[PDB]
């Protein structure tokens, strides 16, 4: 379970990667919450 | 006990293999949390 | 006690696997108390 | 101590099940705290 | 030793058994120092 | 060392009980450092 | 029983070194665990 | 099976040194979400 | 080496006591070290 | 495995000591990060 | 080695107790940067 | 091997304590990656 | 096989421990795993 | 080898006894390493 085993997990966390980079969308959430409250806040100002 | 007795281990490792995969829930429990958090916080900024 | 000796086992240890079984309710006990932990600590950061 | 010391040991479980759901208190104790430190820090900024 | 011996060992045993009880408070110090240290970070957080 | 050793053992818990309680200062020192930066927090907004 | 006994003993341990091989499956079933775990804080963490 | 053993022992070592050089990857994830996390952290506060 | 013994090796426990209550400066090490950190984070927040 | 062994540990250190000094910018991300916001927020201001 | 042996350690610990107080200087740089930060904010207000 | 083969080992372990002190650059590599961590947190929050 | 003999396996001895010095590369192995557990938690933390 | 062969022997256990104490130095070379990993890991931690 090391030689075809470990081209086998590098295949996974290849395949595994896709979820990995949509979880990046939760990360983003707080950085376009930010960039929301800077619009309203540059929207309350103007 | 090792001939057909390691393909039964194997098939009930491959069917208990389920367990494992659901038990990813209650491990993914404190990414939810951390992204429901992360949500209140945006909410709370905006 | 080779012969009907060696069934009488086999069965007593089948018939015994259901207490190995219902031990396994004090093992899962660390990983119930981890995923309580965790569900503390998400509410806690929620 | 196998048979009836089962249904015994499994009766003393169900029953000193009081005392690890009632420690859940101290448990849900972080969980009142941030919630009181979440509804302060509401107060402070209304 | 076996007949009345057993029963012997068997009460002392069971007057034994204080001494173990008792000594659950030592185990059940980690427990208080642990309850301890989060009511002391709920305080901060308040 | 079981018999008047456990009444020893006792008594020396609930003598050096002191310096466990009195360690109770160290911890209450982050509480006494938050609650004093919360009212340098409440002059400053002031 | 020593020299083609030697000689099928050599090629049992040969043969039977699958089953050493595929058990290696439950000693890297830790470090799998432990790298799913470690995802699992970097995802919280995120 | 020391001799020539050493030697293929040896061997074994380098050539497998592949797979614990590759697992640095997992042990790395840990560095690449904390790095994900800072950045999501420094484009929040931006 | 059990009668006069016993006492011989009783005087040599009660003093190499000695030793192991000055040890228990190295134990109070770690405890030293939190408080040192928690003054540190205190000063910080301050 | 001491003697040059010792000699070799020593410079796959200072030879991969630059893998860490490059990591540093990883943790110079956050500050440039912090210098990009605050620039933001005096331009903002002016 | 606990005769001599333990008043040669306790001159080690009261001699290497130099390099932990002056290790103290890292952990005050915190409160350091925190001051200047306050400092910082302050001269922004005015 | 016990007259002048303690005086060897003694006079191996004083030598080969060299390589103790050296391998404490690795123990000590946790107390500068905490202090790099601790910089970088007063830099951002400067 | 005590006079030449004794020389034959001393001469073996010292021959031989060039395999008990390689083995010592599996006994750091913890060391150096240890080592770069503690260098990724070091990078996370920073 | 009884008479004054006894006096012997226990005068060279008691000469002896000077290797079993300096052995001593190797039993407390465990607590001097978990005292090392103690302060390493306070100053990690201040």
């Known amino acids: 379970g090391v030689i075809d085993t470990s081209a086998v ?3 996974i966390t290849d395949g595994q990667g896709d ?3 949509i979880g990046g969308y939760i990360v983003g ?3 376009i919450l930010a960039v929301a409250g800077l619009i309203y806040s540059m929207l ?3």
Do not use: D, I, Q, Y
């Open 19 to 21: 979820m990995k980079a």
């Open 9 to 11: 997990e590098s295949a």
């Open 29 to 31: 959430a707080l950085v």
């Open 44 to 46: 309350r100002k103007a």
